[PDB]
Amino acid sequence: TSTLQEQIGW
Amino acid sequence: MIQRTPKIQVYSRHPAENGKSNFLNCYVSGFHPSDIEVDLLKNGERIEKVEHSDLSFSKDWSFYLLYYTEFTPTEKDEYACRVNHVTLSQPKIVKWDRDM
Amino acid sequence: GSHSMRYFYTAMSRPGRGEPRFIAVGYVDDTQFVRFDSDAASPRTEPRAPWIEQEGPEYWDGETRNMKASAQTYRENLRIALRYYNQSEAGSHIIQRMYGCDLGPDGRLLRGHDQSAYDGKDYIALNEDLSSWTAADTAAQITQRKWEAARVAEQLRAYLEGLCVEWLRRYLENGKETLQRADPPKTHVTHHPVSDHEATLRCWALGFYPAEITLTWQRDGEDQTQDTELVETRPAGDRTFQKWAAVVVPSGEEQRYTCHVQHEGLPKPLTLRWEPHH
């Protein structure tokens, strides 16, 4: 993907 | 203050020529939070069908938006931008000046 | 020469008015090319520049899914922020993030960026080494330890060094006719009397791209930094920009003043004066 795929929370 | 009041610029896309089609711009920037209400006025009446850019922000995190509509300037008519924001006690009205 | 790609995320809670709203935009240099709004009836990543339209369904579907996932993540991040700062669920708050890559003249990664904010203030930022973080306050330090433990910086570094540069270089080639050709400003000087004894000289720069520009007023070869009124660079609405600089001068001294314009589109910097008999 062009955007950052990654997801980790605050 | 977490809240920043907007800067307002009112101007045309092209140099103003009376009777010739143009675009009227109201650029609001440097404000926080993002909720804001902007209207373009012709002799104090709200102009309908005004469009605006997608919400974005600067390096300092303050938001900016462009509001615009097609218009034709004339010697007599007065155009303005009206902005309401949490930081404003009353709506701010900025006169369009073709020299600015 | 140098180029950049940036994604901007805004997530805002609106308790009592609906669920949190997520807005994302993408830029190459000063040109916006995508947008996403969770408030749309059918949220999808949409093109905002002609050169991005050639991308396939795989691209739009993948971007939309990632944006949908990011909206859910920031909905939770807003709830997490309430815990760290001991804030009520009745108030409205905003998380912002900007990340992307800067390319050097040789076309390689010059610098990577990943910064986040809470209510318009710095929260956490990825350091220049792309391996460590800088936290603005004690709440952000809680996030910093979680991200250090989960090896987030390595994920960011892999993206910034790889996919970020690869996609930016692709966009620059596909949109080279507009992205890599600078538009020089159209310039002129106007004169506005304030009184019989004073007047404003205004130097105009119109229809230029990219946005970066330098406008200065000089008196007998001396910059008038203190006395110059400079407006913010502003969009014309056709993807080009405008700016002007003004100075108030005593009547009869106008010809001592010169306006200097520096822009990527100009072969040589410009020097202008008021020329009423042009």
Side-chain angles (χ1 to χ4, degrees):
Chain A
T1 57
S2 192
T3 42
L4 187 61
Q5 200 148 36
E6 206 247 17
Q7 327 257 323
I8 289 265
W10 280 22
Chain B
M1 219 196 332
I2 50 158
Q3 304 191 329
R4 289 170 249 183
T5 199
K7 302 183 203 102
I8 304 163
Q9 292 196 67
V10 196
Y11 55 101
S12 53
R13 174 186 298 183
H14 305 290
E17 270 208 63
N18 289 321
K20 273 163 204 278
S21 200
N22 202 335
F23 281 87
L24 172 69
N25 293 324
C26 182
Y27 181 58
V28 290
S29 61
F31 61 96
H32 215 284
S34 57
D35 276 341
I36 193 163
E37 269 186 8
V38 179
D39 285 291
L40 298 189
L41 316 173
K42 176 180 162 170
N43 300 117
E45 170 165 49
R46 239 161 58 156
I47 298 170
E48 61 159 16
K49 319 313 279 297
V50 167
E51 272 171 69
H52 62 87
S53 65
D54 307 322
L55 182 73
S56 194
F57 52 86
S58 305
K59 264 164 41 179
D60 70 355
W61 306 108
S62 66
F63 297 103
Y64 62 82
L65 288 169
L66 173 66
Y67 285 77
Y68 57 102
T69 193
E70 183 65 13
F71 85 130
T72 44
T74 80
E75 186 183 337
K76 297 301 179 248
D77 301 349
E78 249 182 54
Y79 290 83
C81 182
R82 176 173 74 211
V83 178
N84 205 5
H85 188 252
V86 62
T87 55
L88 303 175
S89 63
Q90 39 174 8
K92 206 184 267 209
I93 295 169
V94 179
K95 312 273 186 130
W96 173 54
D97 182 350
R98 77 185 52 211
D99 296 333
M100 285 183 80
Chain C
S2 169
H3 293 284
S4 70
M5 175 163 79
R6 296 274 193 287
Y7 284 107
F8 300 86
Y9 296 177
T10 306
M12 63 202 73
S13 65
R14 37 205 197 159
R17 269 181 290 150
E19 219 167 299
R21 181 173 195 188
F22 179 84
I23 296 173
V25 294
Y27 282 83
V28 166
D29 299 331
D30 298 318
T31 301
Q32 185 195 358
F33 67 102
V34 291
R35 74 161 177 211
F36 174 97
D37 190 345
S38 67
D39 253 24
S42 189
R44 285 197 64 77
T45 300
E46 306 183 318
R48 302 293 271 154
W51 42 264
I52 199 63
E53 300 189 34
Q54 50 194 284
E55 305 292 341
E58 231 193 73
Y59 178 91
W60 301 104
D61 289 346
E63 291 308 305
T64 292
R65 283 185 282 99
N66 199 38
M67 289 306 95
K68 277 179 186 187
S70 291
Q72 281 310 111
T73 297
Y74 279 93
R75 188 177 88 170
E76 181 69 7
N77 287 346
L78 280 157
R79 298 187 273 247
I80 291 165
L82 291 183
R83 286 214 311 283
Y84 293 174
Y85 293 101
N86 186 43
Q87 297 172 327
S88 148
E89 280 152 44
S92 278
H93 301 271
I94 295 168
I95 290 176
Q96 288 157 272
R97 182 175 184 202
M98 48 187 175
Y99 65 91
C101 41
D102 289 345
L103 286 200
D106 68 337
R108 289 172 183 90
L109 181 64
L110 182 53
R111 183 157 168 175
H113 311 257
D114 185 7
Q115 304 162 71
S116 293
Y118 186 58
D119 288 332
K121 291 161 34 178
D122 285 346
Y123 186 75
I124 196 172
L126 179 67
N127 288 330
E128 191 145 31
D129 61 10
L130 308 187
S131 320
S132 61
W133 308 91
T134 295
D137 61 25
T138 62
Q141 286 174 330
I142 306 175
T143 293
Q144 175 177 4
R145 291 183 282 257
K146 291 175 180 188
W147 288 4
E148 281 165 349
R151 296 173 73 177
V152 172
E154 290 170 65
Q155 296 301 296
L156 258 293
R157 181 170 74 246
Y159 165 84
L160 294 166
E161 290 177 353
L163 281 161
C164 190
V165 168
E166 297 167 9
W167 274 109
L168 171 53
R169 285 170 56 67
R170 167 163 184 181
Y171 301 151
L172 287 166
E173 171 70 25
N174 286 347
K176 62 177 301 201
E177 290 301 297
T178 49
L179 300 180
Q180 296 190 60
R181 309 295 177 250
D183 291 339
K186 277 88 139 168
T187 60
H188 69 286
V189 174
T190 57
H191 179 268
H192 318 268
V194 165
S195 72
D196 286 316
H197 314 269
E198 276 180 328
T200 298
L201 286 176
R202 182 161 289 114
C203 183
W204 296 84
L206 302 167
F208 57 92
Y209 182 95
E212 169 73 23
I213 193 171
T214 298
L215 292 190
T216 66
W217 271 109
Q218 280 171 19
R219 182 194 160 90
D220 297 319
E222 313 253 21
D223 275 34
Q224 300 287 112
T225 314
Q226 296 195 266
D227 300 74
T228 302
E229 159 165 37
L230 198 59
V231 292
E232 275 193 357
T233 301
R234 68 207 196 180
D238 56 8
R239 295 206 187 73
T240 74
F241 299 89
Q242 312 177 349
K243 196 187 191 69
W244 59 254
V247 63
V248 171
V249 308
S251 178
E253 297 196 3
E254 279 89 331
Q255 290 307 323
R256 285 191 192 256
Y257 292 78
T258 57
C259 172
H260 304 254
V261 187
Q262 295 175 79
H263 189 260
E264 194 193 320
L266 301 158
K268 305 258 174 111
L270 298 180
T271 298
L272 303 207
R273 278 191 316 185
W274 180 43
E275 288 177 19
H277 308 99
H278 177 20

